[PDB]
A paper describes a structure:
Typhoid toxin secretion from the bacterial cell is mediated by a unique transport mechanism that requires the activity of TtsA, a specialized muramidase that facilitates the translocation of typhoid toxin from the cis to the trans side of the peptidoglycan (PG) layer of the bacterial envelope. We have previously shown that TtsA’s muramidase activity exhibits exquisite specificity for L-D cross-linked PG. Entirely consistent with the chimera studies, we found that TtsA is organized in two independent domains: an amino-terminal catalytic domain and a carboxy-terminal substrate-binding domain, separated by a bent helix that forms a hinge between these two domains. To gain insight into the structural bases for substrate specificity, we solved the crystal structures of TtsA and its close homolog Sen1395, which exhibits different specificity.
Sen1395, a close TtsA homolog from S. Enteritidis, is unable to complement a ∆ttsA S. Typhi mutant for typhoid toxin translocation because it exhibits different substrate specificity. To gain insight into the mechanisms of TtsA substrate specificity, we solved the atomic structure of Sen1395 to 1.9 Å resolution with an Rwork of 0.20 and an Rfree of 0.24. The crystals belonged to the P1 space group and contained two monomers per asymmetric unit. The structure aligns very well to TtsA with an rmsd of ~0.7 Å over 161 aligned Cα pairs (with 64% sequence identity). The positions of the conserved catalytic residues in both enzymes overlap reasonably well, which is consistent with the observation that the catalytic domain of TtsA can be replaced with the catalytic domain of Sen1395 and retain full function. Despite the very high structural similarity of the two enzymes, notable differences on amino acids located on the surface of the putative substrate-biding groove could be identified. Notably, while the surface of the substrate-binding groove in TtsA is lined by largely uncharged amino acids (Ile116, Gln120, Gln164, Asn166), the equivalent surface in Sen1395 is occupied by several charged amino acids (Asp117, Arg121, Glu165, Asp167). We propose that the charge differences in the substrate-binding domain between TtsA and Sen1395 confer upon these enzymes their different substrate specificity. We found that, unlike TtsA, when expressed in S. Typhi Sen1395 was not enriched at the poles and showed a uniformed distribution around the bacterial surface. Taken together, these results indicate that Sen1395 and TtsA exhibit different PG specificity and that the substrate specificity determinants of both TtsA and Sen1395 are contained within their carboxy-terminal half.
Numbering used by the authors:
A (entry chain A): 11 to 188
B (entry chain B): 10 to 187
Write the structure that this text describes.
Amino acid sequence: PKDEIFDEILGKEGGYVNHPDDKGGPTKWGITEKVARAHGYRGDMRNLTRGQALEILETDYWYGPRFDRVAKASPDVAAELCDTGVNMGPSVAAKMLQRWLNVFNQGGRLYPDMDTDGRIGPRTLNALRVYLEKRGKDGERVLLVALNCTQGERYLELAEKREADESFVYGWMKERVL
Amino acid sequence: KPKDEIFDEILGKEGGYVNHPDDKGGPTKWGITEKVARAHGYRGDMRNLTRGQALEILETDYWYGPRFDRVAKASPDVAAELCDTGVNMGPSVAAKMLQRWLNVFNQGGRLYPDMDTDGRIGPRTLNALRVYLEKRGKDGERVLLVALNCTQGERYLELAEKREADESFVYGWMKERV
Protein backbone atom coordinates (compact mmCIF):
# COMPACT_ATOMS: atom_id res chain seq x y z
CA PRO A 1 0.00 0.00 0.00
CA LYS A 2 3.01 2.25 0.94
CA ASP A 3 4.74 1.06 -2.29
CA GLU A 4 1.62 2.27 -4.24
CA ILE A 5 1.63 5.62 -2.34
CA PHE A 6 5.31 6.31 -3.26
CA ASP A 7 4.98 4.85 -6.81
CA GLU A 8 2.16 7.40 -7.42
CA ILE A 9 4.25 10.33 -5.98
CA LEU A 10 7.33 9.29 -8.10
CA GLY A 11 5.72 9.56 -11.58
CA LYS A 12 6.88 7.42 -14.55
CA GLU A 13 9.20 10.42 -15.50
CA GLY A 14 11.79 12.52 -13.53
CA GLY A 15 10.32 15.91 -14.72
CA TYR A 16 13.68 17.70 -14.04
CA VAL A 17 12.83 21.44 -13.58
CA ASN A 18 15.62 23.91 -12.64
CA HIS A 19 14.21 26.40 -10.06
CA PRO A 20 16.45 29.04 -8.38
CA ASP A 21 19.34 27.70 -6.12
CA ASP A 22 17.38 29.52 -3.30
CA LYS A 23 13.69 28.84 -4.28
CA GLY A 24 13.76 24.97 -4.15
CA GLY A 25 16.77 24.54 -6.51
CA PRO A 26 16.69 22.00 -9.42
CA THR A 27 13.96 19.31 -8.75
CA LYS A 28 13.67 15.75 -10.16
CA TRP A 29 11.32 12.92 -9.07
CA GLY A 30 9.72 15.52 -6.73
CA ILE A 31 13.09 15.82 -4.85
CA THR A 32 14.62 19.33 -4.49
CA GLU A 33 18.47 19.65 -4.64
CA LYS A 34 18.38 20.77 -0.95
CA VAL A 35 16.46 17.61 0.14
CA ALA A 36 18.68 15.37 -2.07
CA ARG A 37 21.90 16.93 -0.67
CA ALA A 38 20.57 16.62 2.91
CA HIS A 39 20.23 12.84 2.15
CA GLY A 40 23.83 12.57 0.87
CA TYR A 41 23.27 12.99 -2.92
CA ARG A 42 26.33 14.82 -4.43
CA GLY A 43 25.70 14.38 -8.24
CA ASP A 44 23.86 16.77 -10.64
CA MET A 45 20.07 16.69 -9.98
CA ARG A 46 19.59 16.01 -13.76
CA ASN A 47 21.10 12.52 -13.06
CA LEU A 48 19.21 11.66 -9.80
CA THR A 49 17.74 8.13 -10.28
CA ARG A 50 14.21 7.03 -9.26
CA GLY A 51 15.85 4.54 -6.82
CA GLN A 52 17.69 7.13 -4.64
CA ALA A 53 14.52 9.31 -4.83
CA LEU A 54 12.46 6.37 -3.51
CA GLU A 55 15.10 5.84 -0.73
CA ILE A 56 14.65 9.56 0.25
CA LEU A 57 10.80 9.15 0.26
CA GLU A 58 10.88 5.84 2.23
CA THR A 59 13.29 7.51 4.72
CA ASP A 60 11.26 10.73 5.24
CA TYR A 61 7.69 9.22 5.10
CA TRP A 62 7.97 5.55 6.20
CA TYR A 63 11.18 4.52 8.11
CA GLY A 64 12.12 7.89 9.73
CA PRO A 65 8.64 8.29 11.33
CA ARG A 66 8.64 4.51 12.21
CA PHE A 67 5.37 3.81 10.29
CA ASP A 68 7.01 0.43 9.43
CA ARG A 69 6.71 -0.55 13.14
CA VAL A 70 3.07 0.69 13.20
CA ALA A 71 2.57 -1.61 10.14
CA LYS A 72 3.76 -4.55 12.32
CA ALA A 73 0.66 -3.92 14.56
CA SER A 74 -1.72 -2.62 11.82
CA PRO A 75 -0.81 -2.42 8.12
CA ASP A 76 -4.04 -0.38 7.51
CA VAL A 77 -3.25 2.26 10.27
CA ALA A 78 0.37 2.60 9.02
CA ALA A 79 -0.84 3.09 5.41
CA GLU A 80 -3.23 5.87 6.52
CA LEU A 81 -0.41 7.56 8.59
CA CYS A 82 1.93 7.32 5.60
CA ASP A 83 -0.60 8.87 3.16
CA THR A 84 -1.40 11.59 5.79
CA GLY A 85 2.31 12.27 6.41
CA VAL A 86 3.17 12.78 2.67
CA ASN A 87 0.36 15.48 2.42
CA MET A 88 0.46 17.16 5.90
CA GLY A 89 3.77 16.03 7.56
CA PRO A 90 4.61 12.75 9.38
CA SER A 91 4.50 14.42 12.86
CA VAL A 92 0.95 15.79 12.18
CA ALA A 93 -0.04 12.23 11.23
CA ALA A 94 1.68 10.74 14.33
CA LYS A 95 -0.08 13.28 16.63
CA MET A 96 -3.52 12.26 15.20
CA LEU A 97 -2.84 8.62 16.17
CA GLN A 98 -1.70 9.69 19.67
CA ARG A 99 -4.76 11.89 20.20
CA TRP A 100 -7.18 9.03 19.27
CA LEU A 101 -5.32 6.40 21.34
CA ASN A 102 -5.57 8.73 24.38
CA VAL A 103 -9.35 9.28 24.04
CA PHE A 104 -9.99 5.50 23.42
CA ASN A 105 -7.95 4.23 26.45
CA GLN A 106 -11.12 4.33 28.76
CA GLY A 107 -9.90 7.05 31.20
CA GLY A 108 -6.48 5.35 31.33
CA ARG A 109 -7.77 1.81 32.08
CA LEU A 110 -6.05 0.25 28.96
CA TYR A 111 -2.85 2.34 29.22
CA PRO A 112 -2.00 5.81 30.58
CA ASP A 113 -2.37 8.89 28.30
CA MET A 114 0.75 9.37 26.13
CA ASP A 115 2.45 12.60 25.06
CA THR A 116 0.98 13.89 21.76
CA ASP A 117 4.59 14.70 20.73
CA GLY A 118 4.07 13.46 17.14
CA ARG A 119 6.85 10.83 17.50
CA ILE A 120 6.12 7.10 17.26
CA GLY A 121 7.99 5.79 20.36
CA PRO A 122 7.87 2.50 22.31
CA ARG A 123 4.93 3.83 24.46
CA THR A 124 2.90 4.76 21.28
CA LEU A 125 3.57 1.28 19.79
CA ASN A 126 2.70 -0.45 23.11
CA ALA A 127 -0.56 1.60 23.42
CA LEU A 128 -1.53 0.68 19.79
CA ARG A 129 -0.94 -3.09 20.51
CA VAL A 130 -2.94 -3.02 23.79
CA TYR A 131 -5.73 -1.09 22.07
CA LEU A 132 -5.82 -3.63 19.17
CA GLU A 133 -5.64 -6.62 21.65
CA LYS A 134 -8.55 -5.32 23.86
CA ARG A 135 -10.87 -3.98 21.11
CA GLY A 136 -9.94 -6.48 18.36
CA LYS A 137 -10.68 -5.94 14.66
CA ASP A 138 -13.73 -3.72 15.54
CA GLY A 139 -11.21 -1.54 17.44
CA GLU A 140 -8.97 -1.33 14.34
CA ARG A 141 -11.97 -0.40 12.14
CA VAL A 142 -13.09 2.36 14.66
CA LEU A 143 -9.52 3.73 14.77
CA LEU A 144 -9.37 3.95 10.93
CA VAL A 145 -12.67 5.83 10.69
CA ALA A 146 -11.49 8.18 13.49
CA LEU A 147 -8.16 8.84 11.65
CA ASN A 148 -10.14 9.56 8.41
CA CYS A 149 -12.27 12.15 10.30
CA THR A 150 -9.12 14.04 11.57
CA GLN A 151 -7.50 13.79 8.05
CA GLY A 152 -10.66 15.24 6.37
CA GLU A 153 -11.01 18.17 8.84
CA ARG A 154 -7.27 19.01 8.25
CA TYR A 155 -7.88 18.91 4.42
CA LEU A 156 -10.79 21.30 5.03
CA GLU A 157 -8.58 23.76 6.93
CA LEU A 158 -5.75 23.37 4.32
CA ALA A 159 -8.30 24.06 1.51
CA GLU A 160 -9.54 27.18 3.40
CA LYS A 161 -5.91 28.52 3.51
CA ARG A 162 -5.35 27.56 -0.22
CA GLU A 163 -2.64 24.90 0.69
CA ALA A 164 -4.87 22.20 -0.95
CA ASP A 165 -7.00 22.23 -4.17
CA GLU A 166 -10.82 22.00 -3.89
CA SER A 167 -10.71 19.20 -6.51
CA PHE A 168 -8.18 17.28 -4.38
CA VAL A 169 -10.47 17.34 -1.24
CA TYR A 170 -13.63 16.54 -3.25
CA GLY A 171 -11.75 13.53 -4.80
CA TRP A 172 -10.39 12.35 -1.38
CA MET A 173 -13.97 12.37 0.12
CA LYS A 174 -15.37 10.65 -3.03
CA GLU A 175 -12.78 7.80 -2.46
CA ARG A 176 -14.20 7.34 1.09
CA VAL A 177 -17.98 6.99 0.19
CA LEU A 178 -19.94 3.64 0.54
CA LYS B 1 -30.92 8.50 11.53
CA PRO B 2 -34.28 10.10 10.40
CA LYS B 3 -35.55 13.11 12.44
CA ASP B 4 -38.58 11.36 14.07
CA GLU B 5 -36.28 8.53 15.31
CA ILE B 6 -33.72 11.08 16.62
CA PHE B 7 -36.45 12.83 18.74
CA ASP B 8 -38.30 9.56 19.60
CA GLU B 9 -35.00 8.24 21.06
CA ILE B 10 -34.37 11.47 23.08
CA LEU B 11 -37.99 11.48 24.43
CA GLY B 12 -38.24 8.02 26.08
CA LYS B 13 -41.51 6.17 26.83
CA GLU B 14 -41.50 7.88 30.34
CA GLY B 15 -41.31 11.59 31.37
CA GLY B 16 -39.28 11.03 34.57
CA TYR B 17 -39.89 14.39 36.35
CA VAL B 18 -36.67 14.86 38.39
CA ASN B 19 -36.73 18.02 40.56
CA HIS B 20 -33.23 19.53 40.30
CA PRO B 21 -32.91 22.63 42.52
CA ASP B 22 -32.82 25.04 39.48
CA ASP B 23 -28.93 25.20 39.62
CA LYS B 24 -28.46 21.74 37.95
CA GLY B 25 -31.56 22.74 35.85
CA GLY B 26 -34.83 20.97 36.92
CA PRO B 27 -37.72 20.54 37.54
CA THR B 28 -37.10 18.47 34.30
CA LYS B 29 -39.50 16.13 32.42
CA TRP B 30 -39.01 14.45 28.98
CA GLY B 31 -35.47 15.94 29.05
CA ILE B 32 -37.10 19.45 29.08
CA THR B 33 -36.13 21.92 31.87
CA GLU B 34 -38.85 24.24 33.28
CA LYS B 35 -36.70 27.11 31.88
CA VAL B 36 -36.93 25.77 28.27
CA ALA B 37 -40.66 24.81 28.64
CA ARG B 38 -41.67 28.30 29.91
CA ALA B 39 -39.42 29.94 27.23
CA HIS B 40 -41.69 28.01 24.74
CA GLY B 41 -44.89 29.35 26.38
CA TYR B 42 -45.81 26.25 28.48
CA ARG B 43 -47.52 27.57 31.70
CA GLY B 44 -48.76 24.28 33.36
CA ASP B 45 -46.85 22.39 36.13
CA MET B 46 -43.58 20.72 34.89
CA ARG B 47 -44.96 17.47 36.45
CA ASN B 48 -47.79 17.60 33.80
CA LEU B 49 -45.69 18.38 30.67
CA THR B 50 -47.08 16.12 27.89
CA ARG B 51 -44.75 14.11 25.55
CA GLY B 52 -46.39 16.04 22.69
CA GLN B 53 -45.54 19.50 24.12
CA ALA B 54 -41.98 18.13 24.68
CA LEU B 55 -41.72 16.88 21.06
CA GLU B 56 -43.01 20.31 19.86
CA ILE B 57 -40.20 21.97 21.93
CA LEU B 58 -37.50 19.59 20.49
CA GLU B 59 -38.80 20.00 16.89
CA THR B 60 -38.77 23.81 17.50
CA ASP B 61 -35.19 24.06 18.85
CA TYR B 62 -33.45 21.30 16.77
CA TRP B 63 -35.33 21.14 13.42
CA TYR B 64 -37.54 24.25 12.49
CA GLY B 65 -35.54 26.98 14.32
CA PRO B 66 -32.21 26.01 12.63
CA ARG B 67 -34.11 25.60 9.29
CA PHE B 68 -33.06 21.91 8.93
CA ASP B 69 -36.65 21.31 7.60
CA ARG B 70 -35.82 23.61 4.63
CA VAL B 71 -32.43 21.79 4.18
CA ALA B 72 -34.52 18.51 4.07
CA LYS B 73 -36.42 19.78 1.03
CA ALA B 74 -32.99 19.72 -0.80
CA SER B 75 -31.52 16.64 0.99
CA PRO B 76 -33.35 14.59 3.63
CA ASP B 77 -30.02 12.83 4.50
CA VAL B 78 -28.00 16.11 5.01
CA ALA B 79 -30.86 17.54 7.14
CA ALA B 80 -30.93 14.37 9.32
CA GLU B 81 -27.12 14.61 9.85
CA LEU B 82 -27.36 18.29 10.81
CA CYS B 83 -30.24 17.52 13.17
CA ASP B 84 -28.29 14.69 14.90
CA THR B 85 -25.17 16.95 15.16
CA GLY B 86 -27.23 19.89 16.41
CA VAL B 87 -28.87 17.93 19.31
CA ASN B 88 -25.31 16.85 20.55
CA MET B 89 -23.21 20.02 19.79
CA GLY B 90 -25.63 22.89 18.99
CA PRO B 91 -27.51 23.43 15.69
CA SER B 92 -25.34 26.47 14.74
CA VAL B 93 -22.19 24.30 15.15
CA ALA B 94 -23.78 21.88 12.68
CA ALA B 95 -24.93 24.66 10.28
CA LYS B 96 -21.40 26.21 10.26
CA MET B 97 -19.86 22.86 9.19
CA LEU B 98 -22.25 22.76 6.19
CA GLN B 99 -21.26 26.35 5.23
CA ARG B 100 -17.53 25.55 5.42
CA TRP B 101 -17.93 22.48 3.11
CA LEU B 102 -20.23 24.26 0.60
CA ASN B 103 -17.60 27.06 0.36
CA VAL B 104 -14.72 24.61 -0.28
CA PHE B 105 -16.81 22.70 -2.92
CA ASN B 106 -17.97 25.80 -4.89
CA GLN B 107 -14.90 25.46 -7.28
CA GLY B 108 -13.19 28.80 -6.44
CA GLY B 109 -16.61 30.52 -6.54
CA ARG B 110 -17.69 29.10 -9.94
CA LEU B 111 -20.96 27.47 -8.58
CA TYR B 112 -21.75 30.35 -6.12
CA PRO B 113 -19.74 32.93 -4.13
CA ASP B 114 -18.33 32.00 -0.65
CA MET B 115 -21.05 32.44 2.04
CA ASP B 116 -20.64 33.69 5.61
CA THR B 117 -19.77 30.76 7.91
CA ASP B 118 -21.95 32.34 10.66
CA GLY B 119 -23.73 29.05 11.58
CA ARG B 120 -27.18 30.40 10.56
CA ILE B 121 -28.98 28.71 7.65
CA GLY B 122 -30.27 31.52 5.40
CA PRO B 123 -31.69 31.73 1.87
CA ARG B 124 -28.11 31.97 0.39
CA THR B 125 -27.00 28.76 2.30
CA LEU B 126 -30.09 26.87 0.95
CA ASN B 127 -29.51 28.31 -2.59
CA ALA B 128 -25.80 27.16 -2.44
CA LEU B 129 -26.93 23.66 -1.27
CA ARG B 130 -29.41 23.38 -4.26
CA VAL B 131 -26.80 24.55 -6.85
CA TYR B 132 -24.19 22.15 -5.37
CA LEU B 133 -26.69 19.22 -5.51
CA GLU B 134 -27.77 20.14 -9.09
CA LYS B 135 -24.10 20.36 -10.35
CA ARG B 136 -22.65 17.29 -8.54
CA GLY B 137 -25.80 15.13 -8.38
CA LYS B 138 -26.38 12.21 -5.97
CA ASP B 139 -22.57 11.64 -5.83
CA GLY B 140 -22.45 15.24 -4.55
CA GLU B 141 -24.84 14.45 -1.66
CA ARG B 142 -22.86 11.29 -0.68
CA VAL B 143 -19.52 13.26 -0.73
CA LEU B 144 -21.01 16.12 1.34
CA LEU B 145 -22.27 13.58 3.96
CA VAL B 146 -18.76 11.99 4.28
CA ALA B 147 -17.23 15.48 4.68
CA LEU B 148 -19.83 16.45 7.33
CA ASN B 149 -18.99 13.20 9.22
CA CYS B 150 -15.25 14.14 9.20
CA THR B 151 -15.96 17.60 10.82
CA GLN B 152 -18.35 15.92 13.32
CA GLY B 153 -15.79 13.22 14.33
CA GLU B 154 -12.93 15.77 14.83
CA ARG B 155 -15.24 18.06 16.93
CA TYR B 156 -16.15 14.98 19.08
CA LEU B 157 -12.39 14.43 19.55
CA GLU B 158 -11.91 18.04 20.77
CA LEU B 159 -14.97 17.75 23.06
CA ALA B 160 -13.70 14.46 24.57
CA GLU B 161 -10.21 16.01 25.13
CA LYS B 162 -11.82 18.87 27.16
CA ARG B 163 -13.99 16.21 28.98
CA GLU B 164 -17.17 17.77 27.33
CA ALA B 165 -18.08 14.34 25.79
CA ASP B 166 -17.74 10.76 27.21
CA GLU B 167 -15.00 8.55 25.60
CA SER B 168 -17.67 5.79 25.38
CA PHE B 169 -19.96 8.14 23.37
CA VAL B 170 -17.17 8.98 20.81
CA TYR B 171 -16.09 5.32 20.44
CA GLY B 172 -19.83 4.39 20.12
CA TRP B 173 -20.41 7.20 17.57
CA MET B 174 -17.42 5.98 15.43
CA LYS B 175 -18.44 2.30 15.78
CA GLU B 176 -22.02 2.97 14.42
CA ARG B 177 -20.35 4.59 11.33
CA VAL B 178 -17.90 1.65 10.83
